[PDB]
Structures are given as C-alpha cells and as structure tokens.
Amino acid sequence: IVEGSDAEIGMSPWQVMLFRKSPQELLCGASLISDRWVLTAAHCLLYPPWDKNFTENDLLVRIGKHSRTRYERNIEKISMLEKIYIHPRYNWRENLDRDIALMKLKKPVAFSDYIHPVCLPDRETAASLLQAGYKGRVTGWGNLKETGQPSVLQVVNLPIVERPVCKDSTRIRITDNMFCAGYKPDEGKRGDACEGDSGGPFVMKSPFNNRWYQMGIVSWGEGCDRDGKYGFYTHVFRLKKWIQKVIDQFG
Amino acid sequence: TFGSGEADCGLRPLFEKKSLEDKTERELLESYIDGR
C-alpha cells in the first residue's frame, strides 16, 4: 500500500495473508467470507507469464494477523487449503478478466475479535455504493513504494473513478468485470495498492446497515500511485453468482 | 444458500460491535454524501 497508514488493531478482521512456504514470503492478500472460504485474485495463484502456478500444498493461509512477520500467539490462526477454485473464464493471457478465485480451508476457522468474515454485496448495496467518487478501503502487506515492505498491515481509502477516465488512463482493454479507484492528479491526495497487495479486499461500509461489504479485489495496476494511473479491482458483485455456485456446490 | 454470507458478516468485534468508530471510516461515509 502506497501513501497509506498503519491499520488499527481489529480494523480488517477479514484480511487474510497468503503465505508461500518455500521460499518464505508473502504471496498475496485475500479475504475471509465464511468460516471455511477465502476469496482472492486468480492471478495470485495462476499467472503463467510470470511462471505462477501454485497448488494447495504450496501455500499457508494466516488469518487474524497484523504484523507482517511476527508470530502473533493466540491471535493469528494458520490454516491449510483443501481446494483452490479459479474462475473457469479467468483470462490470464490478456487482461486478467474475471480475476477471482476461491480457497476452501481444510478446517473451519474460529471467529474472534481479530477474525471475522466480510459481507458480499446484495443488489441494492452494490447499486447504492458503486458510484464515482465514493471511497472504498484497501488493505495489505504489499510494498510501500513502487521501487520497502511494511512492518504491519497498511490501509488506504480511495475513491471509485468514472469508467471513461479509467479507460482513458490505460492501453489495456477494460471489461465490465473491473473497476478502478484512486485520486486524480488534480485532487492532491494520493494512495494505491502495490506489489503484494494483490488479492486483498476493496471494502465499503454500508451507511444503511453499518456493515462492511467487499466490492472489489486488488487485481492489477500500472506501477503504484503514479499520477494519471489508477488501480484496477475485480468487480465482486458481477461475479457473485459464480462465488455462490462454488460454495453451494463444493462446500 | 450462501447468499451474501454470514448473518453476522461485516460487523467488526472491536468497532461496530462496541459502537466505536475507526480513525478514517468517517472519510468513507462522508464520500457517500452526494454534492450539488
């Protein structure tokens, strides 16, 4: 996270760390959506152009964490994956269309003050929140700068950007399964996701029922916090029927 | 039957369930108020 700040304790209890065992490194962010389902970006698990093709046994999931590196006794819970489900139409050859994946935990995780699932948006919630200028929140342990790793989980609030501006900002083909967020050069403020934040949640707090909803997944960006560029996020609501189909069939 | 998730989803034990705000959630809520 670039130009963010330390998250507060318990601020993002759905935040999941995807951890590679060998070599020992943070792979990606992810989010807790039930006691045994974790949501992340498909490109965290499968991206042949960068020789990424992870299996269930390659990764450790760490939930409830705050420190990037310190073992947090009686706070964090580690978990293993029973099965990875990548969207069958995830487009890794081109533009990361449908950049979404689900991970089933082998055991259900106990909820606590530090571990709690985020909501997925219903139709009215999505319609009322996914508006240009409305701010969501991105969290992760990714790099602090484009060229630099944080000691603790970082957070930044970013406004959703008008789709024609998103499209003008990039040579990549943008689909309806993506949106973009970030400040414009004229707005002054800054902030972005960066390498290592991929797969973590873009969340918004409903002013109607006080609940936090995951509207996006950190998907891709041209650099980090560059003027005139914007982070792109997987449009979670548009793919929610696939999420439900997977959990309802394979849970 | 999954729907939008847990009946309890999105309510953080250390904030919403304690009637406590985090340090920047006001910024989000204020952005959801339309201008003129």
Binding site: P49, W50, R89, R93, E94, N95, L96, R98, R123, A126, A127, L130, Q131, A132, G133, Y134, E146, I160, V161, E162, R163, R171, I172, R173, D176, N177, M178, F179, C194, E195, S198, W220, G221, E222, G223, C224, R226, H235, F237, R238, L239, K240, K241, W242 | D34, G35
Partner: peptide, 24 residues
C-alpha cells in the same frame, strides 16, 4: 454520483498485461 461499475451479472482481444512496463 455516476455508476463506476455495472449492476448486473457476468454471463457467458488486446495487449497482455505483462507487456506493460511497471505492471503489478
């Protein structure tokens, strides 16, 4: 105040991302 993403469901070329300098 304008929609930033469409309210519908995904029902079912160009430059690949990995060619863009600085892509992440």
């Amino acid at each position: 105040g304008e929609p930033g993403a469409p309210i519908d469901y995904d029902e079912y070329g160009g430059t690949p991302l990995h060619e863009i300098p600085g892509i992440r």
